[PDB]
């Protein structure tokens, strides 16, 4: 078993009130079965697109999740991952 690493980042420079894309890149996990959710103010974003599952030279799996979003001053965004390596779901917050 390998524990997923999670990184959250925007496609474009964030400006409040401008449409953008938020990416949640999940890496270094094994086995490949995994659940990834993107959250807005603590609630699941319904339409999140998922790349195909793939793997690295080292055999660990990776996958990209992304969703359309328009940041504001007060909205918080996160990516939450459930996986058999972790008793608890891991949540990573988008910075600023």
């Amino acid at each position: 078993q390998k524990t997923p690493q999670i990184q959250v980042y925007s496609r474009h420079p964030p400006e409040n009130g401008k449409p953008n894309i938020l990416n949640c890149y999940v890496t270094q996990f094994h086995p490949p079965h995994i659940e990834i959710q993107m959250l807005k103010n603590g609630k699941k974003i319904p339409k999140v697109e998922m790349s195909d599952m793939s793997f690295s030279k080292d055999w660990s799996f990776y996958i990209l999740a992304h969703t359309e979003f328009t940041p504001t001053e007060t909205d918080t965004y996160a990516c939450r991952v459930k996986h058999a390596s972790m008793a608890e779901p891991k949540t990573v917050y988008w910075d600023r």
Binding site: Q7, Y9, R11, I21, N23, Y25, E49, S51, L64, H66
Partner: peptide, 14 residues
């Protein structure tokens, strides 16, 4: 940091 993929076949790095 590492090279992180964007969804449109471009790359992100910080």
């Amino acid at each position: 940091g590492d090279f992180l993929p964007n969804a449109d076949e471009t790359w992100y790095l910080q």
